[PDB]
Coordinates of N, CA and C in Angstrom, one line a residue:
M1 N 79.6 49.2 53.3 CA 79.7 47.7 53.2 C 78.9 47.0 54.3
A2 N 78.6 45.7 54.2 CA 78.0 45.0 55.3 C 78.9 44.2 56.1
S3 N 78.4 43.3 57.0 CA 79.3 42.6 57.9 C 79.4 41.3 57.3
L4 N 80.4 40.6 57.8 CA 80.8 39.2 57.3 C 79.8 38.2 58.0
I5 N 79.5 38.5 59.2 CA 78.5 37.7 60.0 C 77.3 37.4 59.2
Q6 N 77.0 38.4 58.3 CA 75.9 38.3 57.5 C 76.0 37.1 56.4
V7 N 77.1 37.1 55.8 CA 77.5 36.0 54.8 C 77.7 34.7 55.6
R8 N 78.2 34.9 56.8 CA 78.4 33.6 57.6 C 77.2 33.1 58.1
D9 N 76.3 33.9 58.6 CA 75.0 33.7 59.1 C 74.2 33.0 58.0
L10 N 74.1 33.8 56.9 CA 73.3 33.4 55.8 C 73.9 31.9 55.3
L11 N 75.1 31.9 55.3 CA 75.8 30.7 54.9 C 75.3 29.5 55.7
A12 N 75.0 29.8 57.1 CA 74.6 28.9 57.9 C 73.1 28.6 57.8
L13 N 72.4 29.8 57.9 CA 70.9 29.8 57.9 C 70.5 29.2 56.4
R14 N 71.0 29.8 55.4 CA 70.7 29.2 54.1 C 71.6 28.1 53.8
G15 N 72.5 27.7 54.7 CA 73.4 26.7 54.3 C 74.3 27.0 53.2
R16 N 74.6 25.9 52.5 CA 75.4 26.1 51.2 C 74.7 26.8 50.1
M17 N 75.4 27.9 49.7 CA 74.8 28.7 48.6 C 75.8 29.7 48.0
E18 N 75.6 30.0 46.8 CA 76.5 30.8 46.1 C 76.5 32.3 46.7
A19 N 77.6 33.0 46.4 CA 77.7 34.4 47.0 C 76.6 35.3 46.4
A20 N 76.4 35.1 45.1 CA 75.4 35.9 44.2 C 74.1 35.9 45.1
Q21 N 73.8 34.9 45.9 CA 72.6 34.9 46.7 C 72.9 35.7 47.9
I22 N 74.0 35.5 48.5 CA 74.4 36.1 49.8 C 74.4 37.6 49.5
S23 N 75.1 38.0 48.4 CA 75.3 39.4 48.1 C 74.0 40.0 47.9
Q24 N 73.1 39.2 47.3 CA 71.7 39.8 47.1 C 71.1 40.0 48.4
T25 N 71.2 39.1 49.3 CA 70.5 39.2 50.7 C 70.9 40.6 51.3
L26 N 72.2 40.9 51.2 CA 72.6 42.3 51.6 C 72.7 43.2 50.5
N27 N 72.0 42.9 49.5 CA 72.0 43.8 48.3 C 73.3 44.3 48.1
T28 N 74.4 43.6 48.4 CA 75.7 43.9 48.2 C 76.2 43.6 46.9
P29 N 77.4 44.2 46.4 CA 78.0 44.0 45.1 C 78.6 42.6 45.1
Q30 N 78.3 42.0 43.9 CA 79.0 40.6 43.7 C 80.3 40.6 44.0
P31 N 81.2 41.6 43.5 CA 82.5 41.6 43.8 C 82.9 42.3 45.1
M32 N 82.3 41.6 46.1 CA 82.5 42.1 47.5 C 82.4 40.9 48.4
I33 N 81.5 40.0 48.2 CA 81.3 38.8 49.1 C 82.5 37.8 48.7
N34 N 82.7 37.7 47.4 CA 83.7 36.9 46.8 C 85.0 37.1 47.4
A35 N 85.4 38.4 47.6 CA 86.6 38.8 48.3 C 86.7 38.2 49.7
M36 N 85.5 38.4 50.4 CA 85.5 37.9 51.7 C 85.6 36.3 51.7
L37 N 84.9 35.8 50.9 CA 85.0 34.2 50.8 C 86.4 33.8 50.6
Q38 N 87.1 34.5 49.8 CA 88.6 34.2 49.6 C 89.3 34.3 50.9
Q39 N 89.1 35.3 51.7 CA 89.8 35.5 52.8 C 89.4 34.4 53.8
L40 N 88.1 34.2 54.0 CA 87.8 33.0 54.9 C 88.4 31.8 54.5
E41 N 88.3 31.5 53.2 CA 88.9 30.3 52.6 C 90.3 30.2 52.9
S42 N 91.1 31.3 52.8 CA 92.5 31.3 53.0 C 92.7 30.8 54.5
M43 N 92.0 31.5 55.4 CA 92.0 31.2 56.8 C 91.7 29.7 57.1
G44 N 90.5 29.2 56.5 CA 90.1 27.9 56.7 C 88.8 27.9 57.6
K45 N 87.8 28.8 57.3 CA 86.6 28.9 58.0 C 85.5 28.2 57.3
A46 N 85.2 28.8 55.9 CA 84.3 28.2 55.1 C 84.9 27.2 54.1
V47 N 84.1 26.5 53.4 CA 84.5 25.5 52.4 C 83.9 25.7 51.1
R48 N 84.6 25.3 50.1 CA 84.1 25.5 48.8 C 83.1 24.3 48.4
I49 N 82.0 24.6 47.7 CA 80.9 23.7 47.4 C 80.9 23.6 45.7
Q50 N 80.5 22.4 45.3 CA 80.4 22.2 43.8 C 78.9 21.9 43.5
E51 N 78.7 22.3 42.3 CA 77.3 22.0 41.8 C 77.3 20.9 40.8
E52 N 76.1 20.5 40.4 CA 75.9 19.4 39.5 C 76.9 19.6 38.3
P53 N 77.4 18.5 37.7 CA 78.3 18.5 36.6 C 77.6 18.8 35.3
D54 N 78.3 18.6 34.3 CA 77.6 18.9 32.9 C 77.6 17.5 32.0
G55 N 76.9 17.7 31.0 CA 76.8 16.4 30.1 C 76.3 16.9 28.7
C56 N 76.3 15.9 27.7 CA 75.9 16.2 26.4 C 75.8 14.9 25.7
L57 N 75.1 14.9 24.5 CA 74.9 13.7 23.7 C 75.8 13.7 22.5
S58 N 76.1 12.5 22.0 CA 76.8 12.4 20.8 C 76.9 11.0 20.2
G59 N 76.6 10.8 19.0 CA 76.6 9.4 18.4 C 78.1 9.0 18.3
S60 N 78.6 8.7 17.2 CA 79.9 8.2 17.0 C 80.8 9.3 16.5
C61 N 81.6 9.9 17.6 CA 82.4 11.0 17.5 C 82.9 11.4 18.8
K62 N 84.2 12.0 18.8 CA 84.7 12.5 20.0 C 85.1 14.0 19.8
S63 N 84.8 14.8 20.9 CA 85.2 16.1 20.9 C 84.9 16.8 22.2
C64 N 85.9 17.3 22.8 CA 85.8 18.0 24.1 C 86.1 19.4 24.0
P65 N 85.7 20.2 25.1 CA 85.9 21.7 25.0 C 87.3 22.0 25.4
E66 N 87.7 23.2 25.7 CA 89.0 23.6 26.0 C 89.0 24.1 27.5
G67 N 88.8 23.3 28.4 CA 88.6 23.6 29.8 C 87.5 24.4 30.2
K68 N 87.4 25.5 29.8 CA 86.2 26.4 30.1 C 86.1 26.7 31.5
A69 N 85.3 27.4 32.0 CA 85.2 27.8 33.4 C 84.6 26.5 34.1
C70 N 84.7 26.7 35.4 CA 84.3 25.6 36.3 C 82.9 25.7 36.7
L71 N 82.1 24.6 37.1 CA 80.9 24.7 37.6 C 80.7 25.8 38.6
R72 N 79.4 26.3 38.7 CA 79.1 27.3 39.6 C 79.4 26.8 41.1
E73 N 80.7 27.1 41.5 CA 81.2 26.8 42.9 C 80.4 27.4 43.9
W74 N 79.9 26.7 44.9 CA 79.1 27.3 45.9 C 80.0 27.5 47.2
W75 N 79.5 28.2 48.2 CA 80.3 28.4 49.4 C 79.4 28.0 50.6
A76 N 80.0 27.5 51.5 CA 79.4 27.1 52.8 C 80.4 27.1 54.0
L77 N 79.9 26.9 55.2 CA 80.7 26.9 56.4 C 81.3 25.5 56.6
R78 N 82.3 25.4 57.5 CA 83.0 24.4 57.8 C 82.3 23.6 59.0

Protein backbone atom coordinates (compact mmCIF):
# COMPACT_ATOMS: atom_id res chain seq x y z
CA MET A 1 0.00 0.00 0.00
CA ALA A 2 0.91 3.67 -0.25
CA SER A 3 1.12 6.39 2.37
CA LEU A 4 -1.64 8.71 3.51
CA ILE A 5 0.59 11.73 3.06
CA GLN A 6 0.21 10.95 -0.62
CA VAL A 7 -3.55 11.40 -0.62
CA ARG A 8 -3.14 14.30 1.78
CA ASP A 9 -0.40 15.93 -0.25
CA LEU A 10 -2.24 15.35 -3.51
CA LEU A 11 -5.40 16.60 -1.84
CA ALA A 12 -3.44 19.75 -1.12
CA LEU A 13 -1.39 19.92 -4.30
CA ARG A 14 -4.26 18.93 -6.55
CA GLY A 15 -6.56 20.52 -3.99
CA ARG A 16 -10.10 19.20 -3.96
CA MET A 17 -10.44 16.05 -6.05
CA GLU A 18 -12.09 12.65 -6.06
CA ALA A 19 -10.27 9.61 -4.71
CA ALA A 20 -10.45 7.96 -8.11
CA GLN A 21 -7.86 10.55 -9.08
CA ILE A 22 -5.74 10.24 -5.96
CA SER A 23 -5.91 6.46 -6.19
CA GLN A 24 -4.69 6.75 -9.76
CA THR A 25 -1.80 8.96 -8.71
CA LEU A 26 -0.53 6.13 -6.55
CA ASN A 27 -1.97 3.60 -8.98
CA THR A 28 -3.71 2.41 -5.84
CA PRO A 29 -6.98 0.46 -5.73
CA GLN A 30 -10.16 2.52 -5.61
CA PRO A 31 -11.29 0.55 -2.56
CA MET A 32 -8.25 1.79 -0.67
CA ILE A 33 -8.24 5.58 -0.55
CA ASN A 34 -11.95 5.69 0.20
CA ALA A 35 -11.25 3.71 3.34
CA MET A 36 -8.63 6.24 4.38
CA LEU A 37 -10.83 9.18 3.46
CA GLN A 38 -13.44 7.69 5.76
CA GLN A 39 -10.97 7.50 8.62
CA LEU A 40 -9.75 11.04 8.10
CA GLU A 41 -13.34 12.18 7.82
CA SER A 42 -14.24 10.51 11.09
CA MET A 43 -11.31 12.21 12.77
CA GLY A 44 -11.97 15.58 11.17
CA LYS A 45 -8.98 16.23 8.94
CA ALA A 46 -10.37 16.37 5.42
CA VAL A 47 -13.76 17.58 4.25
CA ARG A 48 -16.34 16.29 1.79
CA ILE A 49 -16.81 18.14 -1.47
CA GLN A 50 -19.81 18.15 -3.79
CA GLU A 51 -19.93 18.37 -7.57
CA GLU A 52 -22.33 20.16 -9.89
CA PRO A 53 -25.96 19.10 -9.46
CA ASP A 54 -28.22 17.52 -12.05
CA GLY A 55 -31.06 18.73 -14.23
CA CYS A 56 -33.50 17.75 -16.96
CA LEU A 57 -36.21 19.16 -19.20
CA SER A 58 -39.93 18.46 -19.16
CA GLY A 59 -43.02 20.15 -20.55
CA SER A 60 -46.24 19.76 -18.60
CA CYS A 61 -45.71 16.80 -16.29
CA LYS A 62 -44.15 15.84 -12.97
CA SER A 63 -41.91 12.88 -12.25
CA CYS A 64 -38.89 12.47 -10.01
CA PRO A 65 -36.47 9.57 -9.49
CA GLU A 66 -36.17 7.35 -6.44
CA GLY A 67 -33.32 9.00 -4.57
CA LYS A 68 -30.58 7.36 -6.61
CA ALA A 69 -26.91 7.73 -5.76
CA CYS A 70 -25.58 11.14 -4.81
CA LEU A 71 -23.40 13.36 -6.98
CA ARG A 72 -19.74 12.45 -7.30
CA GLU A 73 -18.67 13.68 -3.88
CA TRP A 74 -15.11 14.95 -3.91
CA TRP A 75 -12.62 15.05 -1.06
CA ALA A 76 -10.37 17.86 0.14
CA LEU A 77 -8.39 19.10 3.12
CA ARG A 78 -9.71 21.20 5.97
